[PDB]
Each structure stands twice: as structure tokens, then as C-alpha cells.
Point group: C7
Chain length 291, copies 7
């Protein structure tokens, strides 16, 4: 029943994955309802099937003559790609960091409990500093590594990079097609030319500009909101974490803070409820700890 | 099986989250049924496709010429945003207050049970005042804090602020479009101008004014009803809570009532059924307590 | 596995909550099927879209000129409100009476079982009257209260009040629109006036008068049926309830019958199967009770 | 795991409740499919909307001029009412007879098992007649009552009464509208009069006469079949039921057969598998019973 | 975990009940899809609604003038009735034979196991013939009865009778309407007569003759296949069943084979896996049985 | 948790049953979508209903005049019949072979384990050849039988026969209608003759030739692939199976290989994981087997 | 609870199987929505049914005259075949390698645990090299085999081969039909010729070119991404795997690396968490291992 993810990262992943899916569903469920996502004012003597042909041709082309409006067609697929892009760092953390850290937390929790139990017999009263050789050798070995701190940094770095990519994509493509609801589509380009019945230019109107605007604005707003929490999570480990065995923990509590020790200390602090935290909530001393 | 939420707050959160979703579903399920949410009286010689083009264009524009009716289009999305705004304080309370308070309740419950068991042997008859040092040191440490009382106040403060925001939004936007069921829409503004067939102004009628009025009135009524219960919950802790170990509880029962002691006392009173409340329901005395 | 609700109240709540929902579903499921809930005999030269505009406008207005038929539009929503109005007393009883009464029943059941077990050793043969001080002090304390009897009365009072409100609403609004299946609707009131093509008055017919009549009659009938059972439940406690420990129960069996003793006695009688009711089904005596 | 209902009554209740629901579903699922349940031969120059108006008006009126065909409209609702009418006696038996009889069966089963166990020690060989005072006093008390036999009779009486009511309703209303598939409907009665375009009389045809005939015939047939089993169940207890402790049972096996003893004897016989029925299947004697 | 039904009867009941339901679903799911199950070649000047009226009238009448085609309309209901007719014998066997036979099998299995255990102590080496008085008295009592063999015969007899009824119905009604896909329907019989516009006779074509033919042929084929297995099951008990305690079984293995002994012997043989069948699979002898 | 089916036969049955169902669903789900499965080029002056009549008549007839195209109509039903034809051998194996073989495997497994346990005490060191009389008598009795080997052969024989039947049906019927997408249908054969308006011959086109071709080709390909695995399974037992107790197994390992011994040996080899296969994976010797 | 698949192969199989199904669903769900997947500009005097006939005929033919566009019709079926082609290697690995390897891992894990337990008693201080004869004989027997390494290589080889086949198919067929949205279809080839009304050539346009392009590009991209991980998995075993009993493991750690030893070593390393890995996470020595 161990908890292997910080509470903030859980809600960050949930929001970042869920929101593009919700926006994509809000766009799929409207164009199926309204029918065609584009209308065209065909001439009066175009019967019925020729009007449908004009509609389909202008929707397929999507090129304003008098310049290109391709983002309208590729909205839900581009939104769906964002879901996979957000889900990739979660998969990386799931399949690259949690197996080692799970064992590293279980072992340290068990031996911390054992050390507390051993110190209990000393409480009811110095062969204590050397009494835990494992807690010094193992912790010195892990402090010199750089194994999974890199993955923890890189997950947030990837999330920030993809957020910046979304910013660039939106601000470079969707901005130039705002407030553009109609365009002059043409079909007299290929073999249909040299045929006098069909007019030269046909006006057509997009029927889903509101969905486009709402999706763009909402996505920009939420992915703006989601940046400070990400940078806070990234910068959380930069400052040194401070709250018998805890004395030995504080003994090697110094130096550059970029190790594997900081992440396991953070996960230990976030999982303090597993071990006996009776004395943790009450922040002489031996008399109080006697009970 | 501990209960970590007051019964009143449960129903308040349930109502405040559920009702905008129900109203939004009552609006989605009608415009899909009736087809277009707006009709237009196109001229007789407009064939079929041109009438649909006029309908779609006037629905997209939604601007009365002879002034703007944008709330009609943005009703379900604005209602959906209210659901997230209501759900945010619940998330804050879930992820910021309940972990510490759960441990603080478990510890106090266990040691209260232990103290009652110890006093039982004294019942069947003064080393009793000093017999519980933890119940004095821990309770004095928590009484000097201000940790989670701020969150408890801020949840209700946020709910009140968002209710006021809903009031302002409704009374500033929806009021000026009541009793307005039809408008003169125009399409001869862009490239469609200088074309004599289409008339200058086309009358159009909204087919969902009843849903608009009903949703607005119902939402105003329910969020009016939900205010006194919120202010009662906020003001509940302002008055000091009054009902061996309970004597020590009453001993430090004084001073300014804004501490972390008041909230844990309220949760203890609301969870009296966990411990032995045999003597609680019967509100000399030692002879009665002997059984 | 305690039973905390009388069997009659269960079926009363089930009927009173379920029936408006069933009637509302019988009205939603028909107007979605038949299409428009109102038809209009537009002139022959009105094309197609103008007829739909006339239909929508007359349905939105719903005002007979040659007086108002608004109950037809607001039938399912008014029926849905009745469901919440019926559900409110159930919520009140669930969140205001059952927690105290559950403990009060558990304690009395356990101590009744203990007293029966103690009297068993006296059966196989006067320090018996004073042998149960708790059963006298606790029962005298509860007999002087007025705590949850008020809630039990007020639940049925609220149900009766809401039934009377439904009576008044139906008999004051739905009665004047019976046998009215068609009306002369007009659209030439606003900007559509001074336009000679549209006629002055257009006949329209309601296509759901049968559903209206059936719903009204059925609701009146069932809420007429549901009144005598409610008044019987309310008047049940007015008469004093009569069927070692039961001798002490009969000892304080007198006085004004409006206490908290009557309701707990009723719940004890309705939950006689929990304790040992071997002698209850066989209604000298010590010889029979020896087995 | 006690069985509290006779096998015949189970299938009777299942058939009587299920069949009207099945017939109602066979009528709902057809008129939604075919569209309108009535067609009308409007004149050729009635455009499109006027034909729909004529259809809806004639369906709402449903009055043959050259006399009333209201059963066609009220078929599924009248069938649905039969489901509740059939379900009411089941509810009465569930909430009025089974709680007392459950305890009365459990007690008699347990003490019968105890008596058999006591007689076992006498088998391996007269203080036996007086050895079971409870089996005589309790059984004499129950034989003088009339408590739940009245409910058992009244359930079948109510079922028979409602079957007779269904017979009367069908044979008094549905018989006069058989072989009537078309009628002359009129709409020129109210304000539509003094208008020369609409003809005086319009022929209309019912499109669901086959469903009407099939439902009527099937319901009559099944509720004819269901009567002899009901009367057999009612008359089952009139004849006295005949198959140490069973000798005492046979000792008071006489007199008028209308008591509470007959019903509990029937339920005991139908639940013979609960106790040790090893000797029941083998229908000197002590030597055989020794094993 | 006893098995109370022969494997062959299980598949027979499954096929006989499932197949009419499958055929009925294959007919419901096609006429809902294709729309109307009958088309009519109305004249050119019949507008739109008059053609629908002609279609509905000819479908309702279904009477060839120049003789009756009623089986086409009543196909799915007649197929549904066959499901209940097939299910009735299963209900009879479930509610009339299995309760007695279950106890009769449990008792004989337990005492057979006991006898085998007793003979085990004699194996490791004549007070054996009289050692099982119950196995002789009980088996002689059951051999003289005729209780449930009649039900076992009557179930298969009813299945055969209903198969013959299906044969007669199909071969007497469906045969005369094969290769008949169109007919001359008339509507000028009632009040529509003396009206010159509608022609005297209108040709109409059935659009579901293929479904009719396929259903008829398939049903005939499968219910032909299902007869030999039924007659084999019926004739199975006519021949005497042959494979310490089994010696006593063979001792009364003679006489007329129509008893209750044959059916319980068949069920014992079909449930040989319940008891110790170690020696059954190996079909001197005492030396082999020693292990 | 015994495994009673070879892994190859599992996938063979899964493929052979699933694939016709998948192909049938790929044909049902297309003709419901496209509407009519056949179109006809009716003349210009045929109104609307006469065109539908022509379509339905030509689809029902399906007879090219200038020869018969009946396989197009009977594709999904003929595909559905193949599912039952494939499922029949699985039912035969389930209800005719597995009950005897299950017991025969359980007994041999248990006694093999017992023999291994007995030989264990001899390992840690000739009364061993005669030490297992059952393993010789029972195995000699089963080797002389021919009971369930016939069923095992006949299942694969039936599968091969039905595959050959499918080959013959496809290659004899579907081959002559390939590359035939249109035909000249006629309706002027019966009473519609001697009527000048309808032309003599009407061209019609099949709209589902692609589905026909794809289904035919895919089915031929997969049932070609499925033949070598079937013949391998059939020929598997023809060669003698070769890998204290296993010495006795090898002792009677000779003669004609068509017995019941081969199938139980195959199932034993396929279920080697049930017993102790510690020495099986390591393929002097007594020293190695000591551990 | 053993893990029998490498984590990388799990995600590879998941992606390779899921993605063609997702792409196929993205193509099925669009052409059902838009209606026909192809439109045609029929002449004005073609009524309604002739236009539908032209549409269906041109969709069935799909042959540009002025060369063949068959990939458009066969997109979802060709995508569905890829799912089975990807699933086949997973089935091969499931039914050909995992049963032997499961036992081979269980045995080695159990005996490794036993050896560690035996060495524990030697830790707390040379009959150790010969102390594990099984770990040498069994491991030498498996090192000389080539049984399941071939299957492990062949699974990835098959995946690479099918990826190359997909590359060839796409680049040889889909490339020549890009940027081709319309074609000149003809119907005047068969019996419809010599008929002057229908024109010689009819222009038609594909309405699903965007789906075609998106599916092709996306599939190419993802199956390009999936190649380096496959080749990494294939090349993983080529390099020798390096990290009392582990000394014996290192003793035969040499030679050509193509054996069955490498795969079981890889699976042991990937399943290190099953056994006691307390000393694994802490990478003199005996003093540290004493705890």
C-alpha cells in the first residue's frame, strides 16, 4: 500500500492528460450533430446533388483564393496528439524510475523501523553511532549516484518543452485565422473548367468558428495555469530538505543537493504515515518519548 | 472507517457541484432534439441551401443590428465552468487538510480510549492530573498553531466568493437579454454585399428562450438558498464549543477561539460514535458509571 | 443489520418519490417521439421554412389571443421539482434523527439482553427492582426530552403540506386549460407587422393534450390515495403503545404520550426479531419459561 | 435459506405480473417504429403541413362522426395499470404475513429438531406425552387465532377480483370496436369552420388494429388459464392436510380447518427438506429407525 | 454440486428453446431495417400521403382479391409462442420431479458410500446380506411406486406432441402461400367507394418472402433433426440398465422395467463421479481391490 | 485446474468458429449502412414510390433475364450456418470424450505421484516390478480398448469433411457470379403485364460486389491455411510417442499405435507440469536424483 | 506472480497492435458519418434515383478513365489485416516459449534461494564448490541447447519483416494516388451504352482524401519510430550480460553468447525482485552481509 507519486504530480498529470481529450470530445460531438461543418451559398439552379458536391469539394480543398485554412480540418487530430505527448512522460516515469525506488523505499523503511525498535530499549534507561553500519554505507553509496534524479528532472523538463511547443504551434497557426468565418472557394480549377454553368467563385462559411475560438482560448489558459506548478515541482528539490537514526540522517545532510538522496528523502517525507509517526505529530524529551 | 467530513458540508458540496451539471444537461439534451436553436424567416425564393446558409450565418454572428446576444451561445460552457469552480475547494480540502487531521484524530482517539481505560481502574475504588503529560503537551502545541484552520476558513470563503461572482455575472449579462426572442440579423456585410437578390435585413427568432429563462431563474434561486448554510458553517467555530480526560479538555477551554483546537474538537464531537459513548447518551455519578 | 425505518414509511417514500419521476419520463419519451408538441395550419404558399418558423414562434409564445397556456410548456420541470420536494423530508430524517436513535436503540437492546440473561438465573429458582438503575435513570432522562419526536412529526407535516401545495397548484392552474386543444396564435406583433403576406391569425393545435390530462388525473388520484396512510402514521403515536424488564417498562407507562419514549418504543416493537423473542410468539408461566 | 412461498404461487405471480408488461412492450415498440399510429387520406391540394395537422387532430380527437374509439389511445396505460394491480397483493403478502410466519416457522423447526433428538435416546432402548409442554401450549394458542389465514385468503380473493374486473373491462369496451379499422373524422367544428378549402369529412384508418386484436385475445386467454390454478390454491387448505412429535401433531388434527395451523402445516410440508427427512423418504419400525 | 439433468436433455432443451427465438430475432431485425414489409405500385397522381395510406391499408387488410395471406403478418408472434410451448415441459420437470429425486439421490449416495466403507473392513481379511436392511426396504418401496417415471415420460411426450403440432401448422398454412410474392389489394370497399379518383385494384408486393421461406425451411429441418434424439431418450429406459452393494442392486434387477428404480439408476450411472469410482475405471479381484 | 485440450486444437477451434462470425458481421454492418444492397436505373417519369417498388421487386426476384444470382442474397445465412457446422465437433468432444478422460487422467496422475513417492525411499539406499499391479492391469485393460480414440479421430475427420464441403460450395457457386455487377431485371411477368407505362427491361446494379469478393477470397485463404495444422494434429498420434514407473510405461511401449493409450500419453505429456517435473527439466543418476 | 515478459516488449506489442486498430476506427467512424465516401456531379435532369445509381456505380468501379484507385476502397480491411499480422508473433511467444521458460525460471529461483540459505550458515563463521551439483549439471545442459533462443530471435525477426512489408506496400501503392481527389468515371460501358441520355463521362470527387493522407503519414511515422526499439531488443543479448552461487554463475560466463543461458539470465535480471535482493541494492563484505 505504498504511495509512489507526489500528490501534486498526480493532479498535474490528470489535468494535462484529461483536458485535451475533453476539448477533442467537445469538438467531435458538435460537428456530428450539426451535420456539415461548412456551408456554401450555391446558385439557385444547382439542383440538390451539385450543391452537395460543391460543399464536399470546398471542405476538402479549404483554400481561400482572394490564404490557407487547414487548422480547421486538423483540430481534433492535433488535439489527440497532445494527449499522447502528455502521456509519454508518465510512461517514462512508470517504466524507468519506480521499480528501483520502490525497493529503495521498502528497504529503508524496514531498517528505519528496526533502528527505532532497537533505540526503544535504549530509551527506557556510546554503542549507537556504529550500531547501524548499513544506514551509513548504503546511504553513502546512494548519495554518490546520479541514477534516477536525472529521470525526475527530465520528466518535468519534457512537460515544459511540450508546453512550449504547444504555445508555439497555437500562436503561429491559430492566430492568423481568427475572425475569419467565410472565404471564396473555387472548384473551376481542374477538369471542371471550360464549363459555363458553374460560377467562377462560390462563397462559403465556416459553421464552427465558435468551437475553434473556445478550444484555442481554453487550452491556452489552462496550459498557462499549469506552468507555475510544474516549475515549483522542478525547483522543490533545489533547496535542501529539512524537517538517533534521524541524527545520522542529518549527519550527512550537506553538500550539493543534486543526488539520489534528495528524491528518496522527499518520498520518505511524503510517506511518513507508513511508519510510527506518533512522535512526529507532537513537534524531558526522553520522558515524553517514554510513552 | 473514520468520518472526515461534516454532514452539512457533504450535502453542500453535492448540491453545488451537481446542480450546474444537471442544468447543463437540461440544455444540451434540448437543442440536439429540436435541431437548430434558431430559426429565420428567409424569403420564398431562397431554394433550400440558401436558407440553411442564412440560418448558420445568423447563428454564428448572433448580433442584433437595430445589441449583442452572445450569452445564448455560451450558456452550457459557462455552466460547465461553474462545475470546476465549485469542485476546486473540495480538491483543496482533500489534498491539503485531511492527511494531517486524519493522523491528529487517530492519535487523540487512541489516547483518549487509553485514558478512559486507565480511569476505569480508578472508578472501582491525586495521581491523575500528571497522569497524562502527552494530552497536555501535544494539545498545547496544537492550540498555538494556525495550520489547518486557515484552510477550513478559506474553503468556505472561496465558495462565497464564487457565488458572488456567479451573482455578478448573471445580473450583469443575462438581465439585459430577457424578453428578447427575435432580432434582425444581417449577412450583407462582407463579400456578399453589392448583390441584389438577398434582402438587407432578415428576421430571426431564438427557439430556446424558455430554457434560458428557466436555467437562469433556477440557478439564482438555488445559489441564493445555498448561502445561509455556508455562512452558518463558517460561523460555527466562532462560538466556543461546549458539551477525567474531559476535565483536562475543559481546563484549557478558553481564550481566542481561532486555533486548530476548535476544528479537531468539532470533528471529535461529530465522530463521538467511534469511542465508547455509553455514558454520553445518559446525560451517585460514580455508581452510575460503575456499570 | 438493524432496521431503522418503519415498513409503511418505506413504501410511502418510495411511491411519493418514484411516481413523479415515472410521470415525467412518460412525458419526455412522447414529445421526443412525435417531434413537435404543437402543429399549426400555415397557409399553402408558406414554402417550408416559414412553416417551421411559425411553429417555433407559436410554441415559444403560447398565448391564445381571442388566455395563457403556459402549464403545457412547464409540465416536466414542474413534475421534476415535485421529486426534490418529496425527497427533502427523507434527507431530513436521514441526516437529523437516525444517528442519535441508532445509538439509543443499540444501547437499550444490549442492556435489555443483559437484563434478560440476569433474570434467567432467577427463573430457575427482592433484589430485582433496584437491579437495573440504568434502565430507570436513562429512561427517565429520555422521557423528559423532546428531541427527535419533533423531527418525526415534522417529516409527516412537511409531506402533508407539500401534498396540499400540489393540490392547490393543480386545481388552480391545470383546471382552466382542460378541453382546450387549439388556439389562435399570432406572430404579427413585433417587427413582422406591416407586412401583408403573413395572415393576421394562425390556428394551432396542441398534440399532447392526452398526456396532459392523463398525468394530471393520475397524479391527483395517487396523491389522494397517499394521504390516509400519512395521517395514520402521524396519528400512530398519539395512542399509548401497549403490548421483569418489561414490568419496569410498564411502570413508567403513563402520562402525556408526546415524548421521545414513544418513538423508541415503536422502533423497539418493529425490531423485536433482533433479541430473543422465543417467549413473544407464545402469547405455570415460570414452568413454561424454564425451557 | 428458508423458503417462504409455495412454488405454485411463485409462478402465478410471475406470470400475472410479467405478461401485461410484455404485452405493453409489444405495443410501445411498434408505434414508435411505424411512425404515426393512424393515417388519413387528405385531399391532393393540402401541401405537406396541413396533412400532418389533419393527422394530429384526428388522432387527438378520435371520434367517429357517422361512436367513440378511445380504447385505442389508452391501451398501453391501461395495460401498465394492470401490472400495479397484480403487484399489489404480492406487496401485501410481503409486508403483512411473512415476518410473523418466518419466526413461527423457525421456532417450530428448531423445537421439532430438538424433540426428534430427544426421542433418539428413547429409540435405542411413559414420560413422553408431557415431555413437550411448549409444543402443546404454543400450538393450542396458534390454533385459536385467525391472524394470517385471513391475509392468505384475501390475497387470492384480490387476484380473483382483479381478474374479474379485467374481464368486465375488456368485454365491455374492446368488444364494440373490433373489426373497425377506419372512421370519418372531422376538424371543421371549432374556429376552422366557415372556411371552404377544407372538406367536411376526412376518412382516416387505424394502422394498429392487429396489435389491438392480438393483445386483447392473448390477455383474455392467459387470464382465463390463470384462474383454475388460483382457485386450486385457494381451495387447497379447505381439505384437512394429512401426511412421537408427529403423533402429538395428529392429536390435535381435527375440527374446523380454518385456523393459522393449516397454513403453517402447509409451509412445513413444503419445507420438509430443512430438517432430517431421512425417515420421510422410506414411507420392526424401531429397528429400521435405529440406523 | 450434484448433476440433476442428463447431458442429452440439456442440449435438447437448449436447441428447442433457443432456435425459435433466434428465428424470431432474424425476422424482427429485418423489417425494422427495410421499413415497410410491403410495397404498392400506386398511380402517379397520388401525391405522397395517399400512397402511404394505400400501403398501410393493404398491409392491414392483407387479402388477395382475385386467398388470404395472414401468416405473413403473424410470423414473429407465432414463433414466440413456440418458445413458451417448448419452455413449458422444462418448467414441469423443474417444479415437479427434481425436489423428490434430489433427496432420493443424496440419501442413496450417502448410504452407498457408507456400505462401501463398511465392506472395506471386510476386504482386508456371512453377516453381509442382512447388513443393509435399509437398502432393501427402501429400494423395494420405491420399486413398487410409479411417481416420477410418469413425469419423465410425459415431458418427452409433450415435446413430441408439440413438434407434431408445429408440423401440422406449418404444412397446413405456410405451404399454400409459397411462391406468392404479389397480390391485388383493394381499398374501394367501405366508405371510400363511389369515388372515381382511386382505381379499382392496386398491385402490391411482399418484400419479405425470402425471410418467410428461410424461416419455414430452417424450422422444419431442425425440428426434423430433433425428433430421433427425443425418441432415443424416451426409449432409453425401456431396456433394462446393466453395468457387495452392487450385488444387492443386481438381486432385484428384474421384472417389468417401468418403475421409479430405472430413472434413479440412470441418474446414478450418469453421476458416478460423485462417489469413489476408483474401481469403476479398471473394468485376484480382492487383491486388486486391496489398494 | 487440469488442462483437458491440446494448445493447437484450442487455437484451431477458435479460428474456425470466430472467422465466419467476423465475416458475417462485416457483411451485416455494411448493407444496414448503405441502405439498399441494390440500385436500379428507373425511368425519369416513375415518381418516387414506383422506383422503390422496382427496387424491392428486383431485389426479391434476383434473376438475370438475358442466369441466377441467388448467392448474393443468401451470403450471411450461409456464413452463419458454417459457424454451427464448426461448433458441432467441439460439442461432440465436450460431451463425449472429456468425462471419461478426466477421470482416467486424475487416477493415473495420483497413482504416478504415489509410485514416485514410494520409489523415493528406495532412492536413498527386486520388489519393484510387482510393486505396482494396478499400473499394469489397468494399463493393459485400457490398451485393448478403442473407446475414445475413435472420437478423437472423428472430430478432425468431421472438420476436414466440412472444410471440403465449404470448398465445393464456394467453388461451385460463387465462381460463376464473379465480375458480374449488373443485370437486366424484369417485372412485367405477372399481372403487371399488358401495361404500357413500365418498360420491358430495367437495368440494375449490385452495390455489394466488393464485400462478396472480399468475403469469398478471405474465407478460401483462411480455410486453406487451417488444413495443414488439422492434418498434423490427426497424424500426431500415428508415430509412437517417445520421451521405475516410466520403465514400466516403456515396457508396454510397442505394437500397433492405435489404442486409447496414445491419447492419454499425449495428454499426460501435455500436462507434465501438474506432477513433480523437477527431474524432467534436467535431461551418478541416483546421486543427482538424491536432491 | 512471476513476470514473464520484458517491459520494453510489452509496450512494443501494445503499440504495434493498438495503432492499426485505432487508425481503422478513425476511418470507419467518418464514412458512416458523412454518408457516401464519394460524390459525383450528375447532370441537372437526372431526377434523384439516377444520381444515386451513378454514385454507387462509380464507387463500385473506382477506375479513372483518362489509372486505378483501388487502395481507397480497401483501406480499413488492409489496416485490419495488419492487426492480425502484428498479433501473430505474440501468439507464437505465448504458445511456444513461455511454458518451458516458466518452469526453468521457477526451478532456478527456488534452488538459488536454497543455496543462499545454505551459504547463510557459512557466513556467520572448502565444501562449497561441489555443494551444488545441480546448479552445474543443469546449467551445463541448458547452455548446450538452442531451444527457445531461436523463438526469441524469430519473434523480433518476424516483426521486422512485417514492418518492411508494410513499408513496401505503402510506398508502392499509396504514393501514386496522393494529391488525386477527383476522377472521370464512366458507366456507358456495358448494356447502358447506345443510350443518348446519359453523358459519356461523369466527374466524381473523393470526399475522404484527408483521412487517407493522415492515416498513411501517421502509420509511416509510428512504424518508423518502432524500429530502433525492436533492433535494440534483438541486439540486447548479443553482448554478454554482466552484473557463492553468483561466483558459480560467473564461472561458466564465457564463450559464444548464443545459448539458452542468455535469455534465462536476462529474465532473471528482470525479475530480481522475487528473491532476496537486500544485498543487491547496496552495490568487510562479510561483516556487511552479516545483517
Amino acid at each position: 500500500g505504498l504511495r509512489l507519486e507526489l500528490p501534486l504530480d498526480r493532479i498535474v498529470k490528470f489535468v494535462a492528460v484529461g483536458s485535451p481529450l475533453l476539448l477533442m470530445s467537445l469538438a467531435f460531438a458538435q460537428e456530428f450533430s450539426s451535420g456539415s461543418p461548412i456551408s456554401c451559398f450555391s446558385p439557385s439552379n444547382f439542383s440538390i446533388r451539385q450543391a452537395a458536391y460543391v460543399d464536399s469539394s470546398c471542405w476538402d480543398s479549404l483554400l481561400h483564393h482572394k490564404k490557407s485554412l487547414w487548422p480547421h480540418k486538423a483540430l481534433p487530430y492535433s488535439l489527440l496528439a497532445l494527449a499522447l505527448l502528455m502521456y509519454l512522460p508518465v510512461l517514462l516515469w512508470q517504466y524507468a524510475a519506480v521499480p528501483a525506488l520502490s525497493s529503495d523505499l521498502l528497504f529503508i523503511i524496514s531498517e528505519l523501523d528496526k533502528s527505532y525498535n532497537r533505540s526503544i530499549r535504549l530509551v527506557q534507561h556510546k554503542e549507537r553511532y556504529f550500531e547501524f553500519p548499513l544506514l551509513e554505507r548504503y546511504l553513502a553509496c546512494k548519495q554518490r549516484s546520479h541514477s534516477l534524479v536525472a529521470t525526475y528532472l527530465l520528466r518535468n523538463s519534457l512537460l515544459l518543452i511540450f508546453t512550449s511547443a504547444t504555445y508555439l504551434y497555437l500562436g503561429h497557426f491559430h492566430l492568423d485565422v481568427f475572425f475569419q468565418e467565410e472565404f471564396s472557394c473555387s472548384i473551376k480549377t481542374g477538369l471542371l473548367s471550360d464549363e459555363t454553368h458553374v460560377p467562377n467563385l462560390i462563397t462559403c462559411r465556416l459553421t464552427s468558428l465558435s468551437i475553434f475560438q473556445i478550444v484555442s482560448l481554453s487550452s491556452v489558459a489552462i496550459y498557462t495555469i499549469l506552468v507555475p506548478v510544474i516549475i515549483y515541482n522542478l525547483t522543490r528539490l533545489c533547496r535542501w530538505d529539512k524537517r538517533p537514526a534521524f541524527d545520522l540522517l542529518s549527519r550527512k545532510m550537506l553538500g550539493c543537493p543534486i543526488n539520489d538522496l534528495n528524491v528518496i528523502l522527499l518520498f520518505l517525507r511524503a510517506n511518513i504515515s507508513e511508519l510510527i509517526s506518533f512522535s512526529w505529530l507532537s513537534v524531558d524529551f526522553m520522558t515524553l518519548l517514554a510513552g
